[PDB]
Write a protein that binds this ligand. Structure first.
Ligand code: GDP
Ligand code: QWB
Ligand code: MG
Length: 170
């Protein structure tokens, strides 16, 4: 089979994980999607000439059993860590997601991309500089996105695939 990249989208409730995923898969903005639904989605794409499958888990937070969270973190190859640029708490929550994924995977080398979503809004509490400072400390890419306009969406997901490829070559 063609290569499949297992991607996981994490971040506080309300940041736009479902809207980003639906824009990536369906190329539509869905402005209302039940915050409590967690599901996977698939898309066959071409990234840098490689025909591959993106198998994306759109997370929704706590699970019935914490073993389910640990399972998807171990299964996932790369993580989109999403905050919203007008929600400081969602940005502070990135520290928890970064820690938890490394902790579960028991790894100091986990492919991740920091995503600052809702960049179409002038209303902002997290400046680009502050998010760049955090991504610099993690040694990962940072991309500002808008699930509404689709700005940065393919970049965020395709960059994560490229980070997974760099990890595999070691
Ligand atoms: N303006 C704007 N609103 C967005 C964007 N992405 C998501 N939203 C809105 O943010 C809210 C939460 O989005 P949702 O995808 O449910 O977030 P989730 O809880 O992380 O899955 C909804 O009201 C969406 O319409 C975006 O890029 N721009
Ligand atoms: C990454 C990590 C895990 C999954 C699953 C499995 N899964 C878990 C909950 N719902 C579905 C499918 N695609 C994935 C991509
Ligand atoms: Mg959601």
């Amino acid at each position: 089979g063609m290569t499949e990249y297992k991607l996981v989208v994490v971040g506080a409730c309300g940041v736009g994980k479902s809207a980003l995923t639906i824009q990536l898969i369906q190329n539509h903005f869905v402005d209302e999607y039940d915050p409590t639904i967690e599901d996977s989605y698939r898309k066959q794409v071409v990234i840098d000439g490689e025909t591959c499958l993106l198998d994306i888990l759109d997370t929704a937070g706590q699970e019935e059993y914490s073993a389910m969270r640990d399972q998807y973190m171990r299964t996932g190859e790369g993580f989109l860590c999403v905050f919203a640029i007008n929600n400081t708490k969602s940005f502070e929550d990135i520290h928890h997601y970064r820690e938890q994924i490394k902790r579960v995977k028991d790894s100091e080398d986990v492919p991740m991309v920091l995503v600052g979503n809702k960049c179409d809004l002038p209303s902002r509490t997290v400046d680009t500089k502050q998010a760049q400072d955090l991504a610099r400390s993690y040694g990962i890419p940072f991309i500002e996105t808008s699930a509404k306009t689709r700005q940065g969406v393919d970049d965020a997901f395709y960059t994560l695939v490229r980070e997974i490829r760099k990890h595999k070559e070691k």
